[PDB]
Point group: D2
Chain length 276, copies 4
């Protein structure tokens, strides 16, 4: 009785009729994968789960990352604990695609909502596929084939993360380990083949084949275009929600409007491959 209800023409669907606290069937798994490929971000409501169950579910869709730094669930290290009482979250309140400064950015993620404020803290997603398709033909033709530099320091500037000696030493180390690198401006989804804009305000600094002046103008245009309401959805969280999204062709934005109230999410991240 697995049911998929599209939320919006551009992206998003809600899944019901499946219980992911236990192992899903082969058919359910293929149905959800298909739903991911078509709808890009999937939501389940009233789906309480623990870390082990969250991990077993996410692992049906790829291999899982174990973060070395972020707080973790001890018995299930694939599940990262995001608790605002404990951890900074700043990088979330700006449109971004996860870790695109990496050679192989995350495939996507499964988020479970554990403890929420009464309201506030919505999360928006935008589809690079719908956004690319909506560009005029001359722009699609110009951009398809160009490359862009991505740089972690765009979201984690020395100005905010190098205030003290400890933080500074941390920043310089991350800088050293993640030099800027390039990805296609227009990414072909490695499974569906759907083409998507693949720049994001969070990490993209320069379209390589344009001059500095041109690149600045084109990126400002693309950042605005790709985050228009036509290409996005907005989720208002409820406890025990699960979100599962494809980070290869979307961006997201976490609204920062609920401080100082506590919010706790659990996150499992699926390893991705080289964008092309």
């Amino acid at each position: 009785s697995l049911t998929i209800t599209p939320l919006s023409p551009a992206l998003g669907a809600q899944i019901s009729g499946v219980d992911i606290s236990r192992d899903i069937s082969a058919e359910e798994r293929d149905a959800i994968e298909q739903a991911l490929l078509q709808h890009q971000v999937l939501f389940l409501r009233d789906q309480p789960i623990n870390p082990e169950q969250q991990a077993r579910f996410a692992a049906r869709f790829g291999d899982l990352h174990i973060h070395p730094i972020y707080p973790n669930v001890p018995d299930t290290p694939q599940v990262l604990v995001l608790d605002t009482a404990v951890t900074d979250v700043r990088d979330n309140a700006v449109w971004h695609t996860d870790v695109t400064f990496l050679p192989t950015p995350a495939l996507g993620a499964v988020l479970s909502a554990k403890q929420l404020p009464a309201y506030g803290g919505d999360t928006l997603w935008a589809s690079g596929i719908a956004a690319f398709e909506a560009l005029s033909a001359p722009l699609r033709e110009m951009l398809d084939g160009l490359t862009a530099t991505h740089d972690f320091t765009k979201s984690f500037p020395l100005e905010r993360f190098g205030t003290t000696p400890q933080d500074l030493a941390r920043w310089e180390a991350t800088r050293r380990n993640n030099p800027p690198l390039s990805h296609p401006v227009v990414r072909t989804h490695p499974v569906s083949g759907r083409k998507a804009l693949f720049v994001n305000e969070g990490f993209t600094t320069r379209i390589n084949e344009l001059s500095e002046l041109e690149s600045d103008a084109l990126l400002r245009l693309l950042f605005a275009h790709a985050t228009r309401p036509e290409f996005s959805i907005r989720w208002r969280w409820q406890e025990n929600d699960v979100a599962f999204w494809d980070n290869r062709v979307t961006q997201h934005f976490a609204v920062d409007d609920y401080r100082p109230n506590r919010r706790v999410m659990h996150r499992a991240t699926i390893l991705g491959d080289a964008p092309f």
Copy 2:
């Protein structure tokens, strides 16, 4: 009893526990009015209503406008019938505040959702109050006291009216009846006293006390600022929804992602007073 559930800290509330298809009590009216003053846009789901009932409800909150052009319900002409079969809408997918080119723009309006596409057609609202309060102090201090020109031709350029000499002349006719005019950039809500940004991309052409070049830059900034996710909400419609918003301190955006599917809405518009 009547229940008010906020949808986000910046604006928006859902109301349940009240049947607005009948004459509401004085206390219900006041509960809704004060919810409007706080939350700025209100939604009721599962509220089927006919045009007579919708007009009687809306009239509890001010005097109603009968629009001289658009199609209406003949037995209840205060209710505009907004159709797909009877209308085009190439001026809703721009952020706007209704008829701000008038000396007394609408107080607000009540929309009833009659027949909808399976999905698409969301409407967003943004709070000028939240957006104003979030500007840095120096910008708030600069803008509060300035004025801006609003001009219907911004959204209805001569080329739209169109081709013949009749339309130049009838466009000049509407121009003469609706010359460009000014409103405060920072409006004080005439009931609650809350201050709000009061410019909108649909009609605001110029901040009068700035140069053309400065104004162009500041308006582009304010248009982007005021429509950030932090100050907005996004409503996904269901048949028999009712939305009631305060047009004195909000803007809205109708997502253009459902054409040519039919979408029928009935609207009552409440008359407003002079912004200050």
Copy 3:
């Protein structure tokens, strides 16, 4: 005898050793023509001429226009008098190419400096050829083949030119007679074959094959790019100067920094053909 001294690599040359107050030979005319095709704007100093001599000189390079509205020399109506004591030249202080809202914008013009303030009032010219060549290849490739709308109302807005009955009626007549029209974004010079950007902030409102959002961004980029120092020159006038420029591939900007001091120029305008 005829001597040509470039003022900069991008454009501009001073010419000397020819008396243009007399009928110049075919050889001299031809050398000046070649200098125009190369350098795009030419300056002769210490070149006193009267309107009849100015008209005979300009007419060697094409047919002359007799402008309907502006003041001109009675016995030489091909020469327009631009006297700030009479006519306001406040709208020459924006980068523009002359009358590109016409299906056949002027080929060029010959300007004679009659009476000048002690200082101030410089005029700058920028080269569409140099500007086009400096764009990166992907941008050159995208733009070459696109078209753009040009509209006299952009430099002649109703707000400034429609404020009296006579002003409005003249603005309407002009509007009826000159609806917006299109030209290539990248123009091929009809004699030299040299390609040039052919948009200008004065009149260009829209790149037609891009969306409004995209066009606005690309035009703001191009308006800024085309007017950078690398592609322009700045002329400090002296009495009896003559400037002769090719309006097919340049823009110019008259600095308004000398009011209320009186400035008087005489201008002859050469008729152009359809841009392609």
Copy 4:
């Protein structure tokens, strides 16, 4: 000594004084007044040698000896900018000199030794004229705000190189020249005239505005301040001298003449803390 204005916003040509020799107290003070009014001063047909150039510049403040760029060994206050040796493409962006320092240069004197036949113009823009041209509400908002200046805006990591040795040098340079702040509207420490004091080369942020607001306001100000109304464009001739006030101007040296050789000699005058 004659002073001829070149433009309402800024610029004057000086003649009737031989600056290859020592000038009188009155001549020095006349030139100082001209600098305070016109902000950028030019002399033509003024051959000078390095010793004479340093002696002249030193009348207007103490001179800096640059730690990196080539100089005249007998007169090390005179820096040699010779495009056969030194790349000056960096000068082709609107900037005010070294504003990432707590005490940016007061000004500079340039002498043109060798020039291409054409190309290589230098533009200056007046922060005073640009400030005064802003509408009153905008002047009132900006006057009192501060902005961060950061050398890394013009010299990012990639400009130092990609090796670990390049990274280390860049990081040391950052530590020695950290981002710091100056008033957005600077009061000239001598004339008291107010000027916009941001520049595209080094200014990254107006501190009291949000990042979004700052980005928009700086883009407006960078464009506004460099409009033709507030600038002049100098076409060089051999033996020209330019003397300008770096406290309230920006400049832009057009890079359109390579590979033709171009040689300037420069004396740089030390400045004080902007306020």
